[PDB]
Design a protein around this nucleic acid. Structure first.
Lengths: 97, 130, 353, 64, 97
RNA sequence: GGCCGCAGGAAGAGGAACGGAGCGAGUCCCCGCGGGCGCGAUUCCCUGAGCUGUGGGACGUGCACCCAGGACUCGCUCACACAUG
């Protein structure tokens, strides 16, 4: 169901073919799970994380939107939030010591 | 001692054997067990009354609930088999050389204790019926 | 001699009928129903139940199967499962009494069980304290079934009592009063964890199923078979009428609403219980409360949901007293007597004229 | 099995493990007799329960 | 693997047949998942939550210990910790409004 | 108690069938249920220290169990009932 809390995932950039591209701004540069539910700060599910791309410390993500949502609705620099358990640390993707 | 066991008797436990008749029946069972000529369970006694094997059927008068063995008195009356109650199930089991109780035993006749069997049989048939 | 009897000694749902609030005393009696105890043996069984003492080998669904062979009926229900090795109070509803099974299944149970502890404890007082700890609303994991992991759930234990303890065998009798769907096997495991020694439920017996208990009116499976035999071979009802009881005995706790004979058949067809047909009504009827609607002969018509309180019934002159939850009585037990009243006649007259 | 009982002075079951009650009488088993649906001894049970006045029909009728 | 953080689950009471019974002391009276890994404050897995029992607001839990652990090792009132994502809120088990 | 601000109203109080029931189906909930019952022959074996003769087991064999409810949804039937002073 709705999670107990949600942490800042990222901010809205331009839409792209009926899903929304977003710049990732997580604390500690954490990376989301694939198909992780994306929420607005009201804890309402807008979609799911589809693509993750860009440089390690400056990466983006696309969001495959929900049944009822439209890509025209979102404004520039609108923030999106994620359940903190389906984040992963950046250290996992960095090379082994 | 006998009168204390008389408290524990059932509604249906009649005719109850006399104190001396109870002693005769136990001694007849001991001899029959030695000769391998008794049946012990309701499961067993019921099976061989159905086949029509004759014998004195001794019942425990403190058996509860009565539903476990209360069909057997009438099964005997259908076939004219002699039956009798005795004070306790533990003593009936003890008579057959067992620590655990039993609610019924059927003693078959045999040559080695034929006189003791006939003495018990005679007194059982002579009992007043309710 | 009924004239001599105080109203407190009248049977079933007519008990203490004079202490119900009287709306009106006038109605036209109809020769239709009987008192539930004097139903013709066929109808008596079809509206009846058995307070069974379940034996220790078969499952509870096997037992009610055996009952429906013996009595020669098509439907039975059973007031909550007892596990194959458990004995005790199992309300078996027959035919039209199966409409009441949810009320019986949801009722509060009582159990008398034996817990076997896997090591020695200090004494009987230590077990008695662990039972006090497991009073109130408890977590219990429902057992796995068809590899379907049911989630952890809450069930209330109202009272607990430590009856006896044997330090030799490490056996303890307990009595538990509890909500429906409580797992007593699970309780004994938890009681073992709480003591630290470990434990298992050795034995169990259900001593109460809501309204019925082992104290009175309880019968064994032999009585059920035996009573039917006596009816089949000698045409004697006497034994069956002590084994089976009418479903009205299950409803004696509910708040009552007595109806005129005119209204009875209307309600059986699915009409709402209207106020002009109410003769008498109990104190302490609340809104959205499950009530039993009865005839003047004490027969249960239906389980109804009250849309007026006791006080509201006293003030009003018409309207919906209650809506139906489940109709018990058959259609056309009483005749159709609806549309004959003054306002209903005026309506039909003024439509025609 | 293990559960036994004896009746108190107001007819309530008093459960116990011990084979004798506090007055020296034997305790009954809590559990009813084992049942078979293929039981053919209904005649027999009625016959002697009538004889000793312990058939259910001969007892005091319950107050409802 | 080892979780990012762990929250106070409960404290050690007596052992019981080679697993350990523990009084649950979670913030907001949260309830653990069945077979949820139990950790010491060093983030080393000691076992998994087996049973959950007792009253709603004062409940206990047993821990099925790991391959290498023994029930004799633990001291009285020793604290145990759980990954905060396999806790659930008490409201879930309380009745529907 | 008085004063100021915001919000909801600006209200004459209606309706003596409203909008029901009983079945059937699909889907959920409920849901610890290979075990239970009988007979046969070498008394079929067994007072096991193994539960157990108020029953346990072996081999033949047969037999009957695995629902009934509630909720939602889409049918069929019966009504559409204010209860006759």
């Amino acid at each position: 169901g709705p999670p107990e809390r949600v942490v800042l995932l990222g901010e809205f950039l331009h839409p792209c073919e009926d899903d929304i591209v977003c710049k990732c701004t997580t604390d500690e540069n954490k990376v989301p799970y694939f198909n992780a539910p994306v929420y607005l700060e009201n804890k309402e599910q807008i979609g799911k994380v589809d693509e993750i791309f860009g440089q390690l410390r400056d990466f983006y993500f696309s969001v495959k939107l929900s049944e009822n949502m439209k890509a025209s609705s979102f404004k520039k620099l609108q923030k999106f939030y994620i359940d903190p358990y389906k984040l992963l640390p950046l250290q996992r993707f960095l090379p082994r010591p | 001692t006998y009168q204390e066991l008389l408290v524990n008797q059932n509604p249906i436990a009649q005719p109850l054997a006399s104190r001396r008749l109870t002693r005769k029946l136990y001694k007849c069972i001991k001899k029959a067990v030695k000769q391998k000529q008794i049946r012990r369970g309701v499961k067993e006694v019921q099976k061989f009354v159905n086949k029509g094997e004759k014998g004195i059927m001794v019942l425990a008068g403190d058996t509860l609930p009565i539903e476990v063995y209360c069909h057997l008195p009438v099964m005997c009356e259908d076939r004219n088999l002699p039956y009798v109650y005795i004070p306790s199930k533990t003593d009936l089991g003890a008579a057959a050389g067992s620590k655990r109780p039993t609610c019924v035993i059927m003693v078959k006749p045999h040559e080695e204790y034929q006189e003791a069997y006939d003495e018990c049989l005679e007194e059982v048939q002579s009992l007043p019926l309710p | 001699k009924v004239a001599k009897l105080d109203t407190s000694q009248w049977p079933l749902l007519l008990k203490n009928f004079d202490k119900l609030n009287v709306r009106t005393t006038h109605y036209t009696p109809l020769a239709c129903g009987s008192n539930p105890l004097k139903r013709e043996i066929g109808d008596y069984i079809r509206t009846g139940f058995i307070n069974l003492d379940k034996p220790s080998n078969p499952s509870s669904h096997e037992v009610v199967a055996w009952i429906r062979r013996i009595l020669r009926v098509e439907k039975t229900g059973h007031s909550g499962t007892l596990d194959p090795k458990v004995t005790g109070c199992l309300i078996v509803c027959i035919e039209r009494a199966t409409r009441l099974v949810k009320s019986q299944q949801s009722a509060g149970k009582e159990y008398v069980g034996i817990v076997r502890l896997h090591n020695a404890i200090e004494g009987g007082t230590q077990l008695s304290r662990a039972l006090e700890t497991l009073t109130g609303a408890l977590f219990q994991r429902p057992p796995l079934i068809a590899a379907v992991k049911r989630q952890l759930r809450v069930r209330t234990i109202y009272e607990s009592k430590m009856i006896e303890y044997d330090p030799e065998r490490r056996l303890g009798i307990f009595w538990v009063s509890c909500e429906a769907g409580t797992y007593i096997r699970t309780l004994c495991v938890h009681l073992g964890l709480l003591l630290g020694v470990g434990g298992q439920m050795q034995e169990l017996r259900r001593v109460r199923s809501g309204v019925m208990s082992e104290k009175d009116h309880m019968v064994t499976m032999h009585d059920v078979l035996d009573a039917q035999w006596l009816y089949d071979n000698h045409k004697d009802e006497s034994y069956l009428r002590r084994v089976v009881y009418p479903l009205e005995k299950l409803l004696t706790s509910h708040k009552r609403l007595v109806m005129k004979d005119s209204a009875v058949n209307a309600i059986c067809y699915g009409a709402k219980i209207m106020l002009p047909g109410v003769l008498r009504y109990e104190d302490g009827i609340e809104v959205n409360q499950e009530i039993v609607v009865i005839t003047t002969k004490g027969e249960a018509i239906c389980m109804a949901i009250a849309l007026m309180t006791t006080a509201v019934i006293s003030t009003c002159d018409h309207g919906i007293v209650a809506k139906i939850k489940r109709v018990i009585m058959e259609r056309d037990t009483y005749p159709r007597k609806w549309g004959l009243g003054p306002k209903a006649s005026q309506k039909k007259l003024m439509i025609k004229q | 099995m293990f559960l036994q009982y004896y009746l108190n002075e107001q007819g309530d079951r008093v459960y116990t493990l011990k084979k004798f009650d506090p007055m020296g009488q034997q305790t009954c088993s809590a559990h009813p007799a084992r049942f078979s649906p293929d039981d053919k001894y209904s005649r027999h049970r009625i016959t002697i329960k009538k004889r000793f006045k312990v058939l259910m029909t001969q007892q005091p009728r319950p107050v409802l």
